[PDB]
Structure formats: structure tokens, C-alpha cells
Amino acid sequence: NSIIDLGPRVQSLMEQLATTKLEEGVKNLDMGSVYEITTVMVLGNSILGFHKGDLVKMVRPSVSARDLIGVGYATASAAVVRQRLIEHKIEAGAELIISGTAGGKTVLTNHYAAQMCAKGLKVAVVSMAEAERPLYGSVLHVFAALHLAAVSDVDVLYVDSLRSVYNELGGNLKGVSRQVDGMLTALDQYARAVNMRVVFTLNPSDDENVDAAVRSVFKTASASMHTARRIKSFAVNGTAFTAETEIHLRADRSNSANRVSGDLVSR
Amino acid sequence: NSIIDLGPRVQSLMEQLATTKLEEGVKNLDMGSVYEITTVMVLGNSILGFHKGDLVKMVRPSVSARDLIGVGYATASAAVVRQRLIEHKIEAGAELIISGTAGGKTVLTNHYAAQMCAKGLKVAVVSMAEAERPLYGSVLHVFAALHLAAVSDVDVLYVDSLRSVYNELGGNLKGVSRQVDGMLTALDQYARAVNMRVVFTLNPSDDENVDAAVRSVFKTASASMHTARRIKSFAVNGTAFTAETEIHLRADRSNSANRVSGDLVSR
Amino acid sequence: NSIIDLGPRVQSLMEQLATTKLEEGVKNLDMGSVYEITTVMVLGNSILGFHKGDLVKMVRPSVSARDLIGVGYATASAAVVRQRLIEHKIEAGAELIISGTAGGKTVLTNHYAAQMCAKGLKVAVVSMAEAERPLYGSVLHVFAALHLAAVSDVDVLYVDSLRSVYNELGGNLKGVSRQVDGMLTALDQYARAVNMRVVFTLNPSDDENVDAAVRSVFKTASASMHTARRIKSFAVNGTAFTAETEIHLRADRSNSANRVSGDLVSR
Amino acid sequence: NSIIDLGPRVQSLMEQLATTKLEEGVKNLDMGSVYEITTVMVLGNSILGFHKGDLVKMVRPSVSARDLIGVGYATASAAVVRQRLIEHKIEAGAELIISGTAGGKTVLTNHYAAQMCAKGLKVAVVSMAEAERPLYGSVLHVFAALHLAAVSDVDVLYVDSLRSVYNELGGNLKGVSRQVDGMLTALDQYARAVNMRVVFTLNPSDDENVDAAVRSVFKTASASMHTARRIKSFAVNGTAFTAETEIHLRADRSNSANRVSGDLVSR
Amino acid sequence: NSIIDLGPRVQSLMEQLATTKLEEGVKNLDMGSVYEITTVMVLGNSILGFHKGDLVKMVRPSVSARDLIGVGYATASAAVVRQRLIEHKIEAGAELIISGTAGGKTVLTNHYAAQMCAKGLKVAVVSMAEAERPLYGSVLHVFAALHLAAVSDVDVLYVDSLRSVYNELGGNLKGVSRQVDGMLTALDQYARAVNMRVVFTLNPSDDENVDAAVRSVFKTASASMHTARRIKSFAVNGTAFTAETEIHLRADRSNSANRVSGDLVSR
Amino acid sequence: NSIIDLGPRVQSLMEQLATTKLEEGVKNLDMGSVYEITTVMVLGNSILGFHKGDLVKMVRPSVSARDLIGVGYATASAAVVRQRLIEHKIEAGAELIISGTAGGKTVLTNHYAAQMCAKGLKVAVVSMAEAERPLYGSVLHVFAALHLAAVSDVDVLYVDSLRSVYNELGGNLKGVSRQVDGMLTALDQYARAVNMRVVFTLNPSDDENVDAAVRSVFKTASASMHTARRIKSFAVNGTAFTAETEIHLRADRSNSANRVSGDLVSR
């Protein structure tokens, strides 16, 4: 068992999606057939639909897709079940790992990814909106990665990070918090509909007050997502790391301190 | 007797409304035939009309719909009368439940909805613009929910919340208060025309000064709507709640303090 | 003799004007044939003309209607004379009733309207841009109400209020005062051309400094219109009211204090 | 001999110019044939030309008229000479009468117009951008007045006022002073080309600091125009007036104080 | 020998360029055939090319002209050599004469132009963006004048002034300094390519802090152009003038004080 | 061996790219055939592709190129390997030379370019966004130069400077840092894909706080690029220079002080 990098698959799909006629649709793709899922997202005022593993079609409705849908959603077949999540007692939904001046969000993601892979889960990782990463990290890249993972034999998906999406929704401008709330709620709703555990990461480094943005996004994520994790402290001792974290679980409303340490895992 | 959740019906209608030709119209719908009501709303510069339970058509008039209509209205036959509202002495119109840092607007909504259901009224609830809720809560979702309840056998409708509409009208930007006034008035005028009691909720949590926004929206709602209720204090004691509230009744201009307590009712 | 509510007639005309082809014109209307009047108004860069009681047509001129006309005017045959205004010695032109934190502009309007009706004048009232009022109060609604009254047997018309028009012209933003001046002058010019007495009301409640906006609009109205009335104080004693007012008469340039009291008249 | 009011002639021309096909041209007009003059003006990015007394045509050039022309000019035959200006030793060019909080610009205009009429000159007056005046006072209204006076037997033209043009050019916003400079230079250049004396008036009453705007526009007009006159003080004693004025003559660069008094002349 | 005024030639070319089909081109012009030069400039997102003395054509490229070219340039055969500049040891390039509150930029320009004319050079002057000057002074007028002087037997060109271009590039707004830098570099690059000495003048009189704008434009011009001259002091004694100036020479990086006096030369 | 100036080749390509039909493509170019590389960039919402040495075609996809790609990339055959970089142990990737008030970025670039040329590498230099340089320095000019150097026999490329790109991405406005991050990452990713060493230079001289902009861009470049070099001090002693520099190496995370001195090398 090993961790799958979904990055190149998103990159090749984006090349195929660079058509002048997406309204006609792009057929004969091989996105995946393990699960029957339909991903419907809003791009501007238009709707972009990912139908199973074969079709991707854009529609321009008479009324804006913003008024119609808002952000996006998933519809799954009644047969869709990720058995390995049940066996290892991992609940479907989205999780957020947020950090500020302390950092260590990528180090923690790699730690949790390797931990799940060692446990027996089929783990996928997609790197975006960060240095040394080819994917820019737009809302399209997030929904394309979510869909590619959903229709595939992927139990846990790691999206590192939402930096570009946060910027796209005006997060670095201080109407803004509503759009971030909407995105976070849609991502948790998606991971539930698709029966997958999605872990998203964010470091609002482009913001004026980085730690104040962390505190507000953490409060938002605490209500909108299954799990919200804030890195308070982070330090590296050669090949090992240690991080002082604050975790919120929506289920029991609890806010507890958790110390997480381990070795540096490469990606 | 039980409370009806209109959310899934709004969601299915939005899927049907995702057409490239809304100018041609979407026929053979089954929105309801209890009351002959036509809902006319403005979407940008265009008009969206909900004709009885069968048709939904968009028109793009030569002059902007903003200059023509403004927000939206309802037209009905002289036979549109809700007998249960007369029997239980409940006046038609819109009501607002507003809260700030105290919260408890959803808990109060569920309390009043269960109270009306126990009284013998046909109660419908629609959830939107909040965490864990599928509906985004756009102006379209509010008018679609209003129309579905209007043409159906619904005496009282609860819309929780107007958070997205408030944001859409620039409420979180500080010309703004005029658009909020216009919406609130149109919502009361609608409920009177349709002869239904509609209860709207709002928590301006996306605003910079949340409690200052509550005080100004409460003053606006006091004139624009039949009743305006402000939650001053709210606390939960296990399975029970207690809320210190301020209520304004437009009929006698009175502003009185009201203590409301009960058990936590799920949705 | 009784007061005519022009509101429903404006509402039905707006429904007929919701066409995709206003350039072709909307014929066979029955707006009125007592006086041969043509109302020309500017809507954006386009011209909207109300020809007698039969036609309403939109033209999109090569040069903007803003440069061509500005706001709007009325053209009438030499036979347009309202005999009842001569008999009761009432001069044609527009008058403004402005109030701030004191309020009572609607109460004063109803008082003066009932006073004119009792005198023997054919009085019409149009309610817009206010709570419990179906008409939004756009510039179109103002010009439609003016035209409907002008072509009919109406001696005095009351427009309560100009709140939406004031907002539309950027009055609540602080180039703005020029557009308000232009509107006020056009309305006085219209009433004189049409030989009708028109009484407009305004409460800049959407403004940051409401009483400072009242003082500046009152100074503008003092030059732009026949009469300008400012409510300084207003109080209700059961079924009776009393208001301390400041009135400006353009004819003698005089600014005098006037106490006006009476009973509460419903609309 | 009497003063001509050009206002109604500008108003009727604007009605004729309200065509959907100004690119095709509006022929068979009777603007005037005393002098062969062509007026070229810029309206947005388009060019509007007034050819003698017969044609008015709009052209939409490939490059913006702002880059091509800027504001506007006049072309005339070598025979354009106003003999009465030579006989009474009056030089061609534009003159500005500016006032602030002191007022009296209209009273002074009427005083100078009556003085020129009594001298033996053919005087024309156009009232615009002010209370009790039908013309809005756009750049179109100014150029149409200039052209009607130029092609006709008019020695001196009084334009009261440039309030709307000043506002149109962003004068009440504080790039702005360049557009005001450009207009003032174009108006003096026009009057010289057409061999007519044109007197313009301005009161920047829509400006935040009215007297500071007067001081800067007066400094600009001192260089851009033949003469610039600033009203420092103004008072009315029954039927008589007295004004303390500051006049700048471009010819000798001199800035001198001038006391002007007389009787109130109606328009 | 005498100084040539290029103003009327630029004015007549602009009249010929007022076509609806500049994409087709304006042929059979007689701009000049002394030197084979092509002037390419950017107008918005479009390209305007002046080909030798015969053609002027506009192209609308698929990608913006801003990304493609930036400002504008000149292409010429190496046979473009102005022998009189070699004989009188004058280097090709652009020169800036900048003044603030002191003034005297026009007086200095006329002084230097008469000095060069007396030396034996073919001198041309173009007056724009100033009072009593028909040319508005847009970027088009600057490039048209440069091209008309470049293809003709002109050794030294004087462009008084760049006031409108400075305003057009947002110079009077405080991204702005980059556009001014780009223009100044393109103008020096042009003069070098065309092998002509061009002297530009500027007085940022439309700026809030005129002398602070002079200091920053002088620093920019010191790097961007061959020579930058700042008028520190200026006074007129009847028919004579004296100016205290600061000159920067790019060649030796030196910044020295220079006193320049002479008689007032008319234009 | 000598240094190649790619500037004129970029200039000629831009002239060929000034077509109205870039969607049809511009064929039969001779950009280079040493390496099979395709450069894909985003221009607004459109995609501009440089296919090997023959084609350049623009596509306007249904969804924005911003959501699809973001900035731009390079695709190459497995045979794309620059043997001289292996022989001289030089790693592929982008490097940044940043300076503020100290200057000397061009002097250092010329020093390093001559040093690499003397070593035996095929060195190319492209001058843009600076005084005395014909290329404006847009994102198009950067990618055109990148592609032209990529498909050719060029081991090391010097791009002096990114001043215009920094301005284009809103770098001089204080959402901005995300776009600068994205560009810097894309350029490093490009250089790695194309297997070339690219050295970029930047002096944020158009910024309000130049040295504060240097400190933040240096921190960004430290993560986004292979190497980041900051000029702390710089002085010229006749024909020799000396610069106190701070260098960051991404490989070992180290931040060390480096003194670099040499002779002034012309370009």
C-alpha cells in the first residue's frame, strides 16, 4: 500500500478541459468507475458538471448559478460505500488543518497521510496553491481533485492547500466571511454525499493579520466542518517534529488541546 | 399534524430551473394547486415569474426590472383565504426574529414552529444560508420557498435565515439600508397578498459590528414588518432553553420585554 | 367628493410595461383623455414617452438621453387648464414636505390632502418608497403617477415619498446634490407645464446624518420648488397631532414658522 | 432692439436630435444662415457635428474623439465678421463671471446683457443648469446654444450657467482641473473662431468648499479666457444692487477691483 | 532660416483620422518623405501605425497592445541621419524642461528654440495641452507630431507641453509612476531611433502638490531621458527674463546649477 | 563564445503576433528547433500557446484560463536535457536578484552573465521594464523570451527586470502577494520543466516603501525559487564595483552573507 498523488491527473484533465465548446461536453474520459458520482460546481454564473468518469459538460443557465446553487454539490449512487472507513472507524466529512505564523500544516498533513496509509486506508494527496507545486489551486482544481478521488478507490483525500480559493473568495480583503462560510459548508456536505474523508489545509499568509485570520477561519470551520485543527506551536528537531494543536469536534462541541509529534515525511 | 420541511422541494425546483431557455418557460411542474398565486420577482434586470403550480418563466424587459418592480410581489385570486389563520386569530404578514452575540434564533424558531403546529396550524420550515444546510439562501431560494408555501396548504412559514440575502444586498458593507428596507417591506407585502404568516430569521454574523447591525435592522423591521423580535439574552440548561427578548408590534407601536423559555426542539 | 389612490393604476401600468419590445410601443391603453399631455422621461441613456392616454414607447437615441434631456419634461396643448385651481386660487407647481428625526410627513400629507378634498379640489394620492406600501418608488413610478394624474381630472397630486428617488440619485452617498437639484427643478417645471399642484414628501432616513440632509435638501427645495416645508417638531396626542413647521415661499423669499395641528386622517 | 432668448430654440433642436439614426444625419433644419459655421463637439467617444444651419450628424470614429479632438471646435469661412463688434470696439472671445457664497452672478449677467443691448449690439441669452430653468445645461446644450448664436445674427451671447458642465467634468470631485482647463480653453478658442463675444457664468454651489473652488476656477479662467470676473461682495437694496468685483484682463495681465451697481433687470 | 509650427499639420491630420474605418487604413497622405520612418503607438488595446508619409492604419490585435508593445516605438532604415546635428555636435535623444510654481517653461522653450534656429538647425515647435492652444495634447497628438517631424527635414522638435499626457497616465492621482516612467523612456527611445533631438516640457499644475510632483518627475526623467532641466526660479524684467535652473546630464550622471537669461521670444 | 541578446528576437515576434486572428494561429515561424518545448501562458481569460518553433495560437476556453491554468507552464519531450549544465554542475531552476535603494542589480547581472559565459555556458540576456530598454517588460515579453531561450541552445538566461510584471500583478498596490507568489512559483516550475537556469532581477522602485517591498519579495522568493539574492550594499570605485549581498539557498534553507566584487561589464 502507498499514497496516490492526484496532482498529475488533475493537470491532464485541465488540459482536456481547455476547449472552446465545453457546452457540447468532453466525452470518453477515464476519471474513474469505482463509484457513480456526479459533481456539480459553479464557475462564475455557469454550471460545470462532472458526470461519473466519462463526461464533463458546462451549462450557462438563464439565471446565475450563484442564485441557483451557490457553490456546488455531489450526488452519489445508493451503492456508494467506502468500507475501509467503516472498518477503521473514520467518519465521512471534511476536516480543516489551519496554521499561521507557527507553520507546520504541510508537515502535519504528511504525518496524518502516512499514518492513514500505514493503517490500511487508500490515501490520495493533491498539492496546490503553494511553492514548488504545479497546480495553482483554483476552485476548479479543488472540485476536479474531489471528483477524481470520489469516483476512484480513495478512502481519504488530502488537499494542501485552500490558499488560492481563500484569496479567490476575497479572504485577504477586509461579505467576505459569508463566501468562506459557504465554501467550507459545501466542502463538508460534498465529502458526506460522496462518503469520503477529506482533509483540507490553509495558511492565510497573504492576509494582513495572519493569526487573526486563523482565529476567525478556525471559528467558522468549527461550525461548518466535521473537524477543525489549529496549529498553536510547531518546531523541528533534526528529522523529528512536535506540534501543539487545538482541535474542535462538531459532534460533541468540545475544544481540546492535542500534542502531535513524529518524523518528517517527504511528499 | 406535523411540520413540513420545504427545503428538498426548493432544491428539486432549482435543478429543474437550471435551463438555458427560461425565457421559453419550464412547464408541467407540480408546485401546488391549493391556492391560485403568481409570484413575480426581480433577478438582476430580469423578471422571474412563478405562475400557479405549472409554469416558471423569465422575461428580460426593455427597461430594468429594478425600475419596473424593485424587489418582487404576489398576485392572487379573491378566493385566496387561509381559514385556519381566522380560526386561531393570526394576522397575515411577515415577522422577524433577529439575534446577535446572544444567538438562539434557530432554537426560538423551532420553539415557535412546534407551538403553532400544536395549535392546529399547517406549519412549513425552510433552512438556508447556515452551516450543515444544503440551501445557500439566495433571494431566488427565498422567493421559491415563499411561492411553494403560498400555492400549498401552508398557514405559517418559517425561513431560517436571511443571512445570504442580507449579504447579497450589501448589508455587511458600510445605499445599503435602503435595499434592506425594500426587501423587508416586499417580504411583508408578499405575506399579506398571499394571506400567509411568514417568520424570517437573521443573525448578521458576517458584519463587523454584529450587535450594532442587530439594533439598526430591528429598528427597520419595526416599521417594515408586522412584528420584530430581538433576542437580548439566551442560555441553554441541558435540554431546556431560556431567552430574554424585546418585541415590537407595528399595530400598537409598543416595544415590550418578553421572556420565552421551553425545551430544545430538533429540526 | 373623495381622495383617489393612484397606486393600483401605476401598479397595473408597470405590469403592461414589462415587455421585451417597448421600442415598438405599448398601444390601446386607457391612461386618461381629459388633458392632451405627453410625458418624456430619461431611463438610463434611453427615453420613455407617455403619449396622451393610448401610447407608451421607449427610444434609444444615438446620443445619451442624459445629454439630450437630463431628467424629464411634459408637453401639452394650449387648452390644458385646471379650472378648479383658478376657482380656489391655487398656483400650479411642486411643493416639498421634508422631515427628519421628528417624523410626521405622512400625517401632514394626509392632513393637507383631506383639507384640499374638503375645499372642492379633485385630489389624488400615490404612496411609494415606504413601509406597508406596494410601490417601490423608482423615478419610473414617479413619472407614471405624474402622467396618470396629468391626463386625468386631478387638480392636486400627493407623492409620498421620494425616498427611493433620493437614494437612486445617490443622495445617501457623501456630484450628488446636482442630481437632486436637477430632479427637484424638473418636478416643479413638470407641474407648471401640466398646470397641476404636486406635493412631494421626503424623509432621508437612509442617510448617515438625517437632520443635516434635511437642512441641505430644504435649502435646495427653497430655490427649486414653489414651496418648501420642514417639520421641526411633531407629537401625537391620542387621535390628534401637532407639528411645529418652517415654511419657505419662493415668491416672497420669506422663511416663516408655522404651527399646524389636526386629527389623524387614515389613507 | 431687444434681448433674444435662445433657450426654446435649443429645446426644440434637442427634440429633433432624439433620433435612433444620428449617424445618417438630421437634415432640413433652419438653425441659421447669416454665417457659414461648422461646430464639431465630442460626446463621449463620438463626434457630433453641426453643419451650417441644415445638418447635424454624429460619427463614431475608430479612435476615441477624446484622443482625436478633446473637447470641440468651430470652422468658418473667411467672410465670418461681426461688424457691430468692430463699431463698438468689442474683442471676440469668452468671458467668465464667477461667484460663490456672495452670489449675484445672474443679477450681474442681466445687468451686462441690458447694457450691451442698449449700446446697439444683438444680444442673446440662454438659461440652463439652474432653478426655474427648463434646460439641464449639459455640454450638448452649451454647444447647441453656441452654434445657434454663431450661425445667426448674434454679436454677444450670455450662457447662465456652466454648473452642470462643471459637475459633468467632475469639478465637484476632489485629473479634474485638467478637464475644466480644457473646456475653458475650448470655449475661448470657439468664440474667437466664430468671431463672437460669449459670456459664461458659474457658481460651484455643489462643491464642498465653494469659495476655494471659485479662487481656483478664477485663476484657471484668467489664463484660458479673454476676461475673468469674480464677485467678492453682493447686496440688494430694494430694486437696486451693488457688487464688489475682481476683474482679470488677459491682454495686460492686470488684476483690478471694480465696483458695479445698478437696477434689478428681469429675464 | 525660421521656426516651423507643426500644430496646423497635426490638426489637419486628426481631421483626416476621424474615420469609422481606420482598420482599412487612410492612404494617399503627404506626411513627409525626407526620412523613411514608421511610428507604432498603442491607443487603449489597439495599435495605431504611421507608415512613412502615405499610410495610417489601426489594428485591433487578439492580445492587448499594452502586453504586446506597451507605449510605442519607431522603426527606420539606418540611412536616417540628420547631418546638421553632427555638424553642430548635438546628440539625438529626449530632453525634459519641468517647472512648478516658478513657471517659465514656455519662455525657456522659445529661448532655446530661437537659439537653435540662429545656430543653423531646422527647428519645429508644436504647442498643445495649454491655454490659447488649439491642440488638446493627447498621446495621439504627441505621436502624430513626432512622426510628422521625424519624416520631415526637422533636426530639433519642441513639444510644449505633456500636461494632458501626464493627466491621461494618471499622474495627477496619488501604478501611476510606472506609466509616467514608461512614457518618458519610450519618448527618449523614439528620438534616438528617429535620430532627432526632441525637447518636451511639463508643468504638473493639475497636481495637488505641484513642486513635489516636479521633484519626482525630475528624478524619473534624469534616468529615462538624455537631459532633465528643472526651473527653480523665474522672473521677468520688462522684455527680458532670467531663470535659475537645475540640469541633469545622464552621460556623466552630474547634477549642476545653470543660470539662463535672455529676451522674451514670441510664438 | 559570447552573450546573446534575445531582446530584438522578442521585439520581432511581438510584431508578428499583432494579428486580428491569433485563434487561427501564426505559422511558419523559426523560434528554434534545438528542444521540443511547448509554452502555455494565460493572457486575461485566454490561453496563448507557443508550439515548438513553428506555431503560436490563442484559444478562448469556455472556462477562464485563470481557473484552468493560473499563470503558465511548459511541456517538453523526455529528450530535453542541457548537457553543458551537467558538465559545469549547474542545477535547473529560477533565481532572483533583488535590490532596493542600494541598486546594482543590473551591474551584478552583467557580472554573473560574463562569469557564466567565461565558464563555457551558452548565455542569453533579455533587457526589459527599464530606462534605455526598448522592451516594456510585460508577462507576454517574459514568456516569449523564456520560450525563445527554451527551444534554442541557451543554458542560462538573464531576465532584467520583472519591474513591469510586478506592477501588472498589482505589486505596487497595498490579494497582491498571492499573484506575486504564483508568478515566482510558475517561473521556477518553468525553468525546471525546460531544464534551463533562469536568473530574474527586480527593483520595486515604483513602490511606496521600496526596502519593505524588497524584504517581503525576498522572503517569498526564498520559498518559490531555487535561490534568492538581496543586495544590501552597493558602491562603484571608478571601473570596479563591490556589493554586500544576502543569499538564500532553498536546498539547505541557509541564509548567508556574501561579498561580491568585480569590474563594470557593459551590455
Residue numbers in the entry:
A (entry chain A), B (entry chain C), C (entry chain B), D (entry chain D), E (entry chain E), F (entry chain F): 12 to 185, 188 to 280
Quote the original article.
The lipid-enveloped bacteriophages of the Cystoviridae family infect Gram-negative bacteria, mainly plant-pathogenic Pseudomonas species and share similarities with the members of the Reoviridae family, including bluetongue virus and rotavirus. Their genome of ∼14 kb consists of three dsRNA segments small (S), medium (M) and large (L), which are sequentially encapsidated as ssRNA precursors into the icosahedrally symmetric procapsid by the packaging NTPase P4 (15–23). P4 is a protein of ∼35 kDa, which can assemble into a hexameric ring. NTP-binding sites are located on the external perimeter of the ring at the interfaces between adjacent subunits, whereas the nucleic acid binding sites are found in the central channel. P4 proteins are the only known RNA-specific helicases belonging to helicase Superfamily 4 (SF4).
